[model samples]
Target: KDFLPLYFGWFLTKKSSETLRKAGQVFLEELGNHKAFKKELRHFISGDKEKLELVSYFGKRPPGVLQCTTKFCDYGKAAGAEEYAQQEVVKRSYGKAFKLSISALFVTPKTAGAQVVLTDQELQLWPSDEGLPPGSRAQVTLGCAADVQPVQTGLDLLDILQQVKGGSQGEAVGELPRGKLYSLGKGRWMLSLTKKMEVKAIFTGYYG
Candidate 1:
């Protein structure tokens, strides 16, 4: 897998600055300095959690940012082609070449026969093995959001969502995965069939 550089910036309120900064410091102490949060106190003051902001970017690469949202229609019909083309424009603007790839896994109640398969063209497009095993039951899809360098842009956003597991303590019991077993940003990763019939994913990012 290609490793891309990224910088983190946090948005906090005046009152929350001290709290958030302390939390960030503890996080840095635990996770290490390399992934420590970069604080940016917003001038506007609001107590809302939604107002808190965090922005991360690929380091100095100047890759264009593109936003690609997905909606699943008919499986056999073409999907996301037009949005993907726009993402390509963003990529070219950044002077980087990119191609989207997808991985799919058929779900079955029994795990014995479960397997993951990638389209022939997708296999040709992204050939590097980012530690994913062929024919493994787990599967997830990957694609370019915009023309961004550091391919891991989408993954960084996903990490934030993963941090907010359940809305409340009681709801957190069995709703979300305790920890991430595997992830590849826009690329697909597999899920355990034993847990649920289907898994819902939340994604956000700019692909210029």
Candidate 2:
């Protein structure tokens, strides 16, 4: 059996909600009244139909309709993950491990003109140190995104939030902790080894 768990994090500023709502209202109004805007929105709204059809054909759920309920975190939480991955994994490994981070921006119908942001952070397999052996490999992946985009008028607010949260960035390592571990179910694990750890943060930007 293949077990894969995906974790996500998002940072949302108070301004994002307002921005999305405004954008959405503008979009709908333009779609209804402006010829040029209507044409653009037609493409944006209609383009998803084919993609949705493909998903249905494959017996899979459509991509955008459903909401995810598991492994979610906020901007502050994502910053924490980035710090952990970078200091403890990347810097500690001395460039032997792989570290990756990504983020996406979107507008929500509910949020309308608000800005929504999402980010993902991941690490490649860490070599086992003791129980699993040095050669034993494992990986950790964490991700998150904001739910709305900040309005242009609120750019200053977004900047302030980014400064406060430490931004989006990630790290990885090529080693794992040693010793026997037990699972508490629901994708939780307990390790027997105690090691020093550090958290470093990298700042990344938002998507449109």
Candidate 3:
């Protein structure tokens, strides 16, 4: 073969992509402006609490296609790139469209993103040798401040899950049509949606 993709991922359609974008924006705005969230935002940053602003915690998204990457192959430089690409499910799902469920949205000081819940069929394409829990790092990045990587989104999600799972009944901050909001301290917020936001994604590879 002459070349390999930068990564393998699922790309959302234009319409659905905007739909997600709007939802994420609204979620961020409301969560950011809430009194409880605003009070807690002071712990994550420096300077005065009186001047605290949550909206500045994240930055604008770079202009590009939105995708949920399955593998960051880096054009074959990444470990297991070839092995993953050669798998039967990976090969078969290549170019096929599958529905993805957005179970939650989370924001840390570094990144903002949607937590994706993968189905049995979609899980077949996930790389298991990475040592992370199955479906641990699955997320659709919404935006981030400078120097933040997309990987941070999943790490934040994992951190929140672990924190919330410690039997400490999470503090419910708000609710949506089928979603609940919780604070994870130090400006970390999570929005857990009951009725998942379903969107279609095409499994494919990307260059650059």
Candidate 4:
């Protein structure tokens, strides 16, 4: 009763989660083996080149259940936690299962992540960005380092936004519903999802 999970979020169905993780694995494999990217790596780490392993440079993903955070209830500390949950909107939404779309994904030295597009209906469950730009808070954190908290994934995106706000002229990587295929330096890359995935999630309360 004293503690609960981090926030309320959408999670892919079992099949979707498995499929998505497999997709990430393939992308990372191809990226780690890329000649151009590896050359960039050489400039940074000049250790025994023969002993360098590209795959190991990017750490393996942290293993855990996956979900998109809908609203961070702040463990009841937020002024309106229970009231928000008790709203007619959320009450009717409980136990409702549905789907959404992923438009892009990014990988930096710190994390791998994605974007979620909420239907007008689903937006009621998702928090609005308020003064922030459109889709500023919609990122779905895929994984963080073993020692890192998933919450910091939010900070990674914030770092990007701060750069943009200060006029970081990011190069285009590809097309997407939101965000650019920008580079975050240090051999990191963000690409708009070409073959986007559908997320299957259920509306339910968390006390697990």
Candidate 5:
């Protein structure tokens, strides 16, 4: 049967998705309102800096939708099927709520965003980053825009976040209060979060 559990994590409902979307939009709006951020988006997305094509909501993320996957247990008889669920640290933290946050936003290709940082409590729940280093799996993904199987903003965040983690750095020319804007090649940029913003999240185990 294909009914095998692969991972576990948190998900946001409409209310939460909308909250984050609003915040993401506002942040983009502020950026669009500023030539610095706005121009950067244009350069990255359209390959033309002079074009006002990139607006604050260029990457219109759904208001409150988000996805997070931690543990990836391939099969029930799988080692982790037993070890993970039975892990000494996993039990105490189940059924808890997290203040899921949005660290940064980015646009490139299909578009995606980064996620809230992981605390000690989430460390146990956070599994390996799908062999992409702890960084890829680090951010909670903000669903991608319309198309195939939507990637997401948080995934976009990871797009640059991984580069940053894998010994990568972008030209820091960002002037937003959010943090430094790293210039990633291929018309993509990263805004590292420099503050605190929180949304609600809850932990739950998935059984396939």
Candidate 6:
């Protein structure tokens, strides 16, 4: 059988993962209580679900090592598998560790996640077909509500980013001690951190 992997991505170190987890929790708690966030959040619910607490609105993400997938190889079955495996950058990056900067946190009705800013080095490993603006939608999934898939996390981020770039003013909803929050309209919010949270992550293909 040919060598295969479930996916290729960066897995964050334990300490860094914990640090990022707490930061995400703190953001959710802060956003949960904001009046502007509260008002926008209401638009997403239907029927008798009148609660606005974000901590409960989104499903709790199960505990696990946080990773940002570069290519979903699916045990060599995904399209372009052979080409991706043969790239010089892919070969050189295997088993190496790098720092990733989390520049923002985003949440939508479907998903919650942190936006990852990829440098040229990391960008070299991302799949060519992902097709969004370079690094505009790259993210690590924090959580997804019931009936939502984790993949929606990045799509949501991309939607918000595109809206912001398309001349829609992201209303300033609030600011935290460490970041500025903006409403990207229609139940979407993004928190841009004051300082990039740097996390160390190892690059490799995970077979599991």
By how many angstroms RMSD does model 2 differ from the true structure? Answer: 21.2
| Total backbone collisions for each predicted model | 22, 38, 0, 5, 19, 0
lDDT of 1 by residue, 116-199 (tens): 233343233221222323322122212222333333433433332343233211221111131212222222222222322222
Best candidate per lDDT, number? 6
TM-score-sorted candidate list, best first? 6, 3, 4, 5, 2, 1
Model 6: how far residue 197 lies from native, Å:
0.9
Checking candidate 6 for backbone clashes, the offending pairs are none
TM-score of each: 0.19, 0.21, 0.91, 0.73, 0.64, 0.92
Displacement of residue 74 (Cα, Å) in model 3 is 0.5
Candidate 4: the clashing residue pairs are 8-70, 9-68, 9-69, 9-70, 10-68
lDDT of 5: 0.58
> Where does the lowest 10-residue lDDT sum fall in candidate 3?
46-55
Where model 1 places Cα greater than 4 Å from the true spot, the runs are 1-50, 54-118, 134-149, 154-208
7-53, model 2: which lDDT tens digit per residue?
22122233532333233333333223433323334333333321222
- How far in Å is the alpha carbon of 5 misplaced in model 6? 1.2
Show model 2 residue runs off by greater than 4 Å: 1-6, 37-208
**Model with the higher TM-score, candidate 2 or 5:** 5
Extract clashing residue pairs from model 3. Answer: none
Instruction: Let me know the TM-score candidate 4 reaches against the reference structure.
Output: 0.73
Model-by-model lDDT, in order? 0.24, 0.25, 0.79, 0.62, 0.58, 0.82
Cα lDDT tens digits, model 4, 129-187, are 22455546566666665466766766676665565566663766443343345555664
Candidate 2 lDDT for residue 68 = 16
Worst 10 residues of 1 by lDDT: 105-114
TM-score of 2: 0.21
Stronger candidate by TM-score (1 vs 6): 6
Cα lDDT for residue 162, candidate 2: 43
Candidate with the larger TM-score of 3 and 5: 3
After TM-score superposition, the amount by which residue 124's alpha carbon in candidate 2 deviates from its true location, in angstroms, is: 15
